[PDB]
Amino acid sequence: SQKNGIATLLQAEKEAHEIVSKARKYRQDKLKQAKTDAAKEIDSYKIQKDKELKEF
């Protein structure tokens, strides 16, 4: 259980590394999402102001 216990400690550490890595990718994704959902909300406000400018 000497290298059976070190072997479990190594896996546990590797498991921790991926969990932390996933939340860092989650945030990364969220920064791209802000841009996306923001890019749509601009052109909807664009098309209303074009419409009431053209009514005039």
């Binding site: 000497q2 290298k3 070190i6």
Partner: peptide, 14 residues
């Protein structure tokens, strides 16, 4: 530094 590698690979192999 060679011996603390020889005596700590052995501890993992045990």
């Amino acid at each position: 530094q060679r011996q603390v590698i020889f005596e700590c690979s052995k501890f993992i192999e045990v």
